[PDB]
């Protein structure tokens, strides 16, 4: 493959440019095209950043891009390296997210972090080095889930009904940090995701057994605990011997239901790109296994 | 750099495929001695719903040896469920001939080494190709009739992200999705798994794709070739 | 085609709770234009009974039956009245076919079978397929019920038609493995196609009837008494009269103020005036203009466009904030030094609407927007064109103007800027009548718009007949 | 009318453009294939105003 | 890429001889270090009497998998494989591998010849099993968990006895019952209630979201979904909500299906293509 990529700069880089570009060695930067030679405009997310179009659009563009690790900069050349599956690399988190050991990491567009400064880097003319966020899986599928629930809830609601609920949904709290999702528009892509959610939920409701349906009621008759209280409360405002006992029916239905559940899960789950096992005690870099 | 394995196959399966390259598939049976049967994409082209009448007749006219007849018999047995019985092995390297055949397949990497596909089974969503092309083997189930009819494909696409690929595959295969839900309505006592499944093959270059014929038993069947294929086998992952 | 089928199933699954029967409609160039067909965002429908009562409101009566208030503090009911109105409209599914078609061929090329009584082709530049529900409040359907159709566009503009259930059911009621509902719906097909007008005979649309509909199974009853149609016609009369009674209220107010003052008009608008002029012919031109304004006033008069932003939900709260702001106590020295700086008051320029009536060639302009500000030297008003240019019609002897300020103060101005000044009184109109006739549409979220409010929405959705559709 | 205008000229049926994702992964389409023979050089297609 | 393991306990001739039989087997360790203690070796550290199989299956997912490759002395050397390279691994699970199987790791269910015990600690290694057998074992365990509230009936006792028994190529064994002392362990209980809760929430929410999305584009798929829902409601017929509560139901549905991602998915770890005649060991390509 094109194991190395040359990025050439058209703007002459000052002393400060070369310095700050050197400090960024091992940062994860994406390229759209996977070519041996590219120009600095194609580097990063700045080619696509567009706040009138939503967060989901930039998410869709990013999840299809090719990701690279920055290496030594020389005169007007930056030398990006593509990681390969199963090997071990040192990666840099320019994002404000905390990494704990053993985390599985995903790539997402940046979110709004409180201070609003966000450290603009390499503003050459009116180009800018907009790097993505390398986020651990829990926060990644939390943002994907909240974004889907905003799309699914706020349809056919007016702005007055919507306002407080989506204000509460946009804010995510993760490891004592606080982030906000920038532009959650109701895209065409988001409507496709919502349609897949509806079909998968219909198949869950249709093909579920009677055991899988009625377990909770029987446990509530048998048992009482805080978890069961919460589960009952979710069903409350809408709220016997089996007449068929069929292990083959149960196996057929369950092997189909797991398929539908994986379909519904893929709307929330992102692709793991790195897995960490060593974290610098200042949380500025990690040792990672590259995955794809 | 390439990793190879050795397999033994009966002459009946080899009769059409004995050429120095092919995609090899292990197929499962509900039996004791012949549990697993090594099959090529040509043989599945018989059972596929997408292959044209002339080519299906050609392949049936070849695969009359008893081994292929038993292979197809076991292929049809359990409907809605083709892909569960199949595990995919690597692309084939040069072969040793005999009443018991020995052929070595490369399961990873690369070191001509081409991948051969029939013309009918090859589809491309995009009419222009990116410099790096990813190859997939996908199976889609049509529930329109009483029996399930499988459609077998080999796809080359610039998309490697799975969610984007499955979005576009759902966009193309919407009629089969409606057939799947309709099947759930009209035959409630039968429980299908999924609309279709996708498996990842390796990556190829867009300018190395060529269309040609591959003659056996003096019958000209048309073939697409990925000239310098590199093998990276993934899982059969299901989409609805 | 699919919208009719889905909507039939949807109204069946909801029938016990709602008792709304599914009415399948097709619209073409006889009801809407091509741009309006391509850019249509919502279709909403409303049910009103033989007594003029909407089915979203309380079955016996409402607190909106009381007269209006004239108070900006009340804003004709505020948020609660607005919410009672919004609850009254129900949203319908719709699909646009934006390229020219012939309807029967389109239905046959789909899965449907068509066995009409006479095979007359109907051809249409574009088609909108939508399903409305008319409410049989029991297993009984009256001919005096009327149904309202509303078409809405992305800027929030709407268009209302209304037709009574007698027109729709004039013929349809006067005569009265396993299978899937979809296949038998297509196979059973269509056998009726009827053209229906609205009450005022402005717009024609076609009704499509299917033999597989759950409508057929119910064997519910239909009736039309004479007295019920009479009362429904009277309610309709009261409905359309709402803008004209306001116009007459303003006219009587002008004449009452003119009687009270004795014909002495003080100057309220800046214009250098001469004594050596035949001001009597100006009075005669004023007579002709005030007759002609009544001759040509309409729904798009300045008075309706002035009351319409008052009916918006924010209006009452904002008015109360303004009342607090203008009557706030003078700040103490501590607040000026240490505390925050005071709110900026009202901007020097206000937005008004006017009716400009020229006599020489009889013409009246109605929905005219002007910007108004008081000049510093003398506190008279300067009326400017919304591009910032001084309006010249104060200097033309053959034109008079009626302005209505955003707080429902009206001026009637003669050449020279001598004006009659009084307030528009809403007390002749019940709160519900104004509120239902003229409340602005507020949008629910849909495709291609931000979840956050106030954002600059991106390229607006469109279905294109001129381009190969994108997917 | 569209099909009649297609036939009067030598033009072909309309085509969808590339998606933003696909135009990001690919760098062109070139819908005019090469002619069977090229005696003179490159086609200098005239633009008409 | 070797990891050193040291024994804080007195080894003996039989312990080292027992340990040298495992000189290619798969041993998982909690996290990557260069020098670890034997306590971290194997799955024993995670075993308790209140959580059980589902908890182990979750924990075994994010361990690091390693192959034993020497015993130099009082220390054990472990080699962590890298993706794509070919390695020799020992079969010690309940079944035999054929050429081209996709192999999965499960927490073990049967346990004598393997067991190296020292000081209440014993080396417990996962099962390396082909993917279909892992999926079927998993589904059988889950169905036995859902039958757990009506063991009062003789037919359900027979059905659980049928579920316990699984036959796979030239092998046959009984999966142990997840119900002990009439009660289901805490993690299997919460897995079962997550499955049932996601089913109920889907059946309650699907109609409203089908209506909302069909108001946008009434595609034929939505027609068929609405018909299926109506049929389901006719079957149930044999016998408004606030915005906050709607968001709570949606969020609860999604957080419940996050509980199932360990069960519903199944990682392939080794692909086998070369087998010894003994079926004791095979060479496999590593997936990670």
Give the per-residue SS3 of E39-59: HHCCCHHHCCCCCCHHHHHHH
**Residue C21: HSE in the Cβ half-sphere, 13 Å Cα cutoff:** 27
Rounded to the nearest 10 degrees, the angle between the axes of helix C181-188 and helix E220-236 is 120
For residue E28, the Cα-to-chain-centroid distance in whole angstroms is 14
C431 close to C68: Cβ distance less than 8 angstroms: yes
**Residue A267 contacts C, CB cutoff 8 Å:** no
Touching pair D, E by Cβ (3+ pairs < 8 Å)? no
As a whole number of angstroms, the longest Cα–Cα distance in chain C is: 99
For residue A57, what are the CA distances in angstroms to A8, A53, A117, B137, C455? 28, 7, 24, 28, 17
From chain D, the residues in CB contact with A65 under 8 A are 24
Radius of gyration, alpha carbons of chain C:
27
Tell the residue number behind the tokens 């107010």, with chain if given.
C253
Cα C425 from Cα C409, distance rounded (Å): 10
**CB half-sphere exposure, A133, CA atoms < 13 A:** 22
Rounded distance between C-alpha atoms, residue A146 and residue A161, angstroms: 17
Residues of B in contact with D22 (CB under 8 A): 126, 158
Residue E207, Ramachandran bin (φ over 0: left; ψ between -120 and 50: alpha; else beta): alpha
A contacts of D21 (beta carbons < 8 Å): 60-61, 64
Please, which chains are in contact with B (at least 3 CB pairs closer than 8 A)? A, C, D, E
CB contact under 8 A, E224 and B181: yes
Resolution in A, one decimal? 3.3
Residue C375, exposed/middle/buried by CB under 10 A (0-12, 13-18, 19+)?
Answer: exposed
- b/e sequence B146-169, b meaning 16+ C-beta within 10 Å: eebbbbbbbbbbbbbbbbbbbbbb
Residue of B146, B171, B185 lying closest to C180 (CB–CB): B185
Question: Can you tell me whether residue B17 is helix, strand or coil?
Answer: coil
Taking CA–CA distances from D20, the nearest residue in chain C reads C471
The sign of the dihedral angle between the CA atoms of B123, B125, B128, B133 is negative
Helix or strand (DSSP H, E) at C19? none
C-alpha–C-alpha distance, residues E274 and E284, integer Å: 7
For the record, the structure tokens of E264 come out as 């519903």
d(CA A32, CA A34) in angstroms, rounded, equals: 6
CB contact under 8 A, D14 and C468: yes
Instruction: Nearest chain A residue to E254 by CA: give it.
Output: A145
d(CA A89, CA A85): 10
Give the tokens for residue C68: 């209006």
**Is D25 part of the contact surface with chain A (CB cutoff 8 Å)?**
yes
The length of chain E in residues reads: 288
- Residue C307 · residue C434 · CB < 8 Å: yes
Tokens for A83, please give them: 């990681």
SS3 at position C343: coil
For an interface test with E, the pick among C7, C8, C9 (most E C-beta atoms closer than 10 Å) comes out as C9
* Residue carrying the six token digits 């990690």: A286
Do residue A263 and residue B159 have CB atoms under 8 angstroms apart?
Answer: no
Instruction: Identify the CA nearest to E75 among candidates E38, E45, E43, E40.
Output: E38
Contact A111, A174 (CB under 8 A): no
Which tokens go with A80?
A: 């990006």
d(Cα E168, Cα E131) in Å, to the nearest integer?
12
In contact, C139 and C218? CB cutoff 8 Å: yes
Q: Which of C352, C355, C350, C471 is nearest to C412 (CA)?
A: C355
Distance CA E260, CA E198 (A): 10
Q: How was this structure determined?
A: cryo-EM
Q: Which residue shows structure tokens 């033009």? A: D11
Cβ B43 vs Cβ B72: under 8 Å: yes
Compute the 3-state secondary structure of chain C and give helix, strand, coil in percent, each to the nearest 5: 30, 25, 40
Residues E67 and E26 sit within 8 Å (Cβ to Cβ): yes
What is the torsion angle, in degrees rounded to the nearest 10, for the CA atoms of residue C178, residue C180, residue C183 and residue C186?
140
What is the pairing mode between strands C363-374 and C381-385? antiparallel
- Cβ(C215)–Cβ(C38) below 8 Å: no
- Estimate the share of chain E in helix, then strand, then coil, as percent rounded to the nearest 5: 40, 25, 35
Would you give the distance in Å from CA E154 to the centre of its chain? Answer: 29
How large is the greatest C-alpha to C-alpha distance in chain B, in angstroms? 52
Nearest CA of chain E to the CA of B235: how many Å?
8
Give me E83's structure tokens: 């993706």
Distance from CA of E265 to the nearest CA of A (A): 8
Tokens 């819908």 locate to D31
| Residues in a beta bridge with B223 | B118, B212
Residues of chain E in contact with residue C93, where contact means CB-CB under 8 angstroms, are 214-215, 218
Contact E223 C13 (CB under 8 A): no
**Whether the Cβ atoms of residue E196 and residue E251 lie closer than 8 Å to each other:** no
Phi, psi at C411, each rounded to 5°? -120, 145
Q: Check CB contact under 8 Å for E268 and B7.
A: no
Contact B158 D18 (CB under 8 A): no
Structure tokens at B72: 């197809």
The nearest CA of chain E is from the CA of B178 a distance in Å of: 6
Mutate to test the interface with B, among D16, D20, D26, D29 (most CBs of B within 10 A): D26
Collapse the DSSP code of A35 into the 3-class scheme (helix H, G, I; strand E, B; otherwise coil) and give the result. Answer: coil
Nearest to E250 among A153, A205, A214 (CB): A153
d(CA C400, CA C383): 14
The residues, ordered by sequence, that sit 6+ positions from C133 with a Cβ below 8 Å of its Cβ are C11, C18, C20, C21, C22, C23, C45, C47, C90, C92
Q: Which residue of C has its CA nearest to B186?
A: C178
User: Of C6, C12, C447, which is closest to E214 when you measure between CB atoms?
Assistant: C6
CB–CB of B61/B69 below 8 Å? no
Residues A270 and A99: their CA atoms lie apart, in Å, by: 17
Any chain B CB within 8 A of the CB of C179?
Answer: yes
Q: How many CA atoms lie within 13 A of A255 on its CB side?
A: 18
Longest dimension (CA), chain D: 39
Q: How far is CA A14 from CA A19, A40, A79, A122, C292, in A?
A: 9, 15, 18, 10, 75
Length reported for chain B = 240
* Residue C317 sits at the chain A interface (C-beta within 8 Å): no
């Amino acid at each position: 493959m094109e194991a190395n990529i040359f990025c050439t700069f058209d703007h002459k880089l000052s002393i400060a440019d070369v310095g700050k570009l050197t400090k960024l060695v091992a940062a994860v930067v994406p390229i759209p095209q996977r070519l041996h030679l590219i120009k600095h405009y194609q580097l990063g997310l700045h080619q696509f950043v567009d706040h009138t179009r939503g967060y989901v659009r930039l998410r869709g563009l990013l999840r299809n891009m090719t990701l690279t690790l920055m290496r030594r900069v020389e005169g007007n050349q930056i030398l990006l390296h593509v990681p390969t599956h199963g090997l071990l690399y040192t990666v840099l988190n320019t994002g404000p997210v905390t990494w704990e050991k053993g985390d599985a990491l995903c790539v997402l567009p940046p979110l709004f972090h409180g201070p609003l400064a966000r450290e603009n880097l390499l503003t050459l003319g009116q180009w800018e080095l907009v790097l993505p966020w390398i986020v651990p899986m829990p926060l990644a599928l939390e943002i994907n889930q909240r974004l889907l629930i905003m799309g699914l809830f706020s349809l056919d609601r007016s702005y007055e009904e919507v306002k407080a609920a989506v204000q509460q949904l946009q804010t995510i709290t993760f490891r004592d940090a606080t982030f906000t999702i920038p532009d959650p528009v109701i895209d065409q892509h988001l409507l496709i995701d919502m349609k897949t959610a509806c079909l998968s939920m219909s198949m869950v409701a249709n093909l579920a057994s009677e055991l899988t349906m009625t377990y909770v009621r029987k446990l509530a008759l048998e048992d009482s605990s805080m978890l069961l209280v919460k589960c009952q409360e979710l069903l409350m405002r809408l709220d016997a011997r089996p007449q068929h006992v069929s292990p083959d029916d149960e196996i057929a239905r369950l092997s189909a239901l797991f398929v539908m559940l994986r379909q519904l899960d893929d709307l929330i789950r992102e692709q793991v790109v790195f897995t960490v096992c060593d974290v610098s005690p200042d949380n500025k870099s990690a040792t990672c296994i590259f995955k794809g | 750099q390439a990793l190879t394995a050795r397999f033994f196959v009966p002459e009946g399966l080899v009769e059409f495929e004995a050429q120095p390259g092919a995609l090899l598939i292990r197929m499962e049976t509900g039996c004791d001695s012949p549990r697993h049967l090594y099959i090529s994409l040509y043989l599945l082209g018989i059972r596929a719903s997408n292959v044209s009448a002339s080519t299906r007749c050609l392949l049936e006219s070849v695969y009359t040896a008893s081994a292929a007849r038993a292979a197809l018999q076991w292929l049809d047995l359990g409907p809605h469920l083709l892909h569960r019985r199949l595990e995919t092995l690597g692309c084939v390297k040069t072969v040793s001939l005999g009443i018991t055949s020995l052929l070595t397949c490369v399961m990873r990497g690369y070191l001509v080494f081409a991948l051969m596909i029939p013309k009918d089974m090859y589809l491309t969503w995009e009419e222009t190709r990116g410099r790096l092309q990813y190859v997939y083997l996908i199976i889609v189930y049509d529930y329109d009739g009483p029996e399930t009819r499988p459609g077998i494909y080999v796809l080359t696409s610039s998309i490697a992200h799975w969610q984007t690929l499955v979005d576009v595959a759902r966009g193309k295969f919407a009629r089969e999705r409606c057939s799947f839900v309709n099947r759930r309505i009209t035959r409630p006592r039968q429980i299908p798994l999924c609309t279709g499944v996708i498996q990842k093959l390796g990556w190829c270059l867009a300018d190395d794709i060529h269309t040609s014929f591959l003659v056996h038993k003096e019958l000209k069947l048309s073939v697409v070739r990925l000239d310098n294929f590199s093998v990276e086998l993934g899982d059969f992952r299901e989409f609805v | 085609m699919e919208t009719h089928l889905y909507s039939d199933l949807a109204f069946e699954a909801r029938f016990a709770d709602d008792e709304q029967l599914p009415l399948h409609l097709v619209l073409d160039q006889e009801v809407l234009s091509n741009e309006e067909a391509e850019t249509l965002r919502y279709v909403y429908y409303r049910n009103v009974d033989s007594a003029g009562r909407s089915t979203g409101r309380a079955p016996g009566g409402d607190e909106d039956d009381a007269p209006a208030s004239d108070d900006a503090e009340d804003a004709v009911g505020g948020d609660r009245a607005f919410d009672r109105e919004r609850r009254t409209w129900q949203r319908a599914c719709f699909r646009v076919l934006p390229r020219p078609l012939e309807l029967l061929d389109y239905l046959r090329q789909s899965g449907l079978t068509v066995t009409l009584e006479k095979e007359q082709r109907v051809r249409m530049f574009y088609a909108v397929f939508t399903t409305l529900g008319l409410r049989c409040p029991d297993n009984r359907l009256s001919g005096a019920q009327t149904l309202h159709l509303r078409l809405v566009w992305p800027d929030g503009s709407y268009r209302d038609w209304e037709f009574l259930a007698r027109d729709l059911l004039r013929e349809e009621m006067e005569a009265n493995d396993e299978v899937a509902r979809t296949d038998e719906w297509k196979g059973a097909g269509v056998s009726r196609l009827r053209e229906v007008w609205d009450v005022q005979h402005r717009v024609r649309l076609r009704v499509l009837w299917y033999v597989n509909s759950f409508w057929r199974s119910r064997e519910l009853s239909y009736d039309d008494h004479e007295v019920e149609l009479y009362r429904a016609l009277d309610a309709y009369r009261a409905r359309i009269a709402v803008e004209y009674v306001l116009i007459r209220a303003v006219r009587d107010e002008i004449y009452a103020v003119l009687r009270r003052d004795g014909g002495a008009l003080p100057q309220r608008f800046a214009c250098h005036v001469s004594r050596n002029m035949s001001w009597r012919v100006v009075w005669e031109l004023c007579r002709h203009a005030l007759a002609l304004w009544m001759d040509w006033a309409d729904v798009r008069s300045c008075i309706i466009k002035a009351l319409t932003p008052r009916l918006s939900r924010g209006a009452a709260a904002a008015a109360q904030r303004a009342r607090r702001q203008r009557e706030r106590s003078a700040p103490k020295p501590q607040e000026l030094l240490f505390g925050p700086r005071n709110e900026s008051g009202p901007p020097a320029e206000q937005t008004w609407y006017a009716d400009v009536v020229r006599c020489v060639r009889a013409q009246v302009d109605l929905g005219v927007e002007v910007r108004a500000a008081r000049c510093p030297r003398t506190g008279l008003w300067i009326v400017r064109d919304r591009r910032g240019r001084l309006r010249r019609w104060l200097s033309q002897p053959e034109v008079c103007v009626l302005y209505v300020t955003p707080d429902l103060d009206f001026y009637w101005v003669l050449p020279g800027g001598f004006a009659v000044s009084s307030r528009v009184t809403l007390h002749g109109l019940a709160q519900r009548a104004l509120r239902d006739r003229f409340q602005n549409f507020e949008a629910v979220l849909a495709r291609g718009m931000h979840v956050e409010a106030g954002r600059q929405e991106p390229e607006t959705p469109r279905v294109s007949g001129r381009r190969l559709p994108f997917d | 009318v569209d099909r009649w205008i297609r036939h009067a000229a030598g033009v072909e049926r309309p085509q969808l453009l590339d998606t933003e994702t696909i135009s990001m992964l690919t760098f062109g389409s070139m819908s005019e294939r090469n002619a069977a023979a090229t005696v003179h050089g490159q086609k200098a297609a005239c633009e008409l105003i």
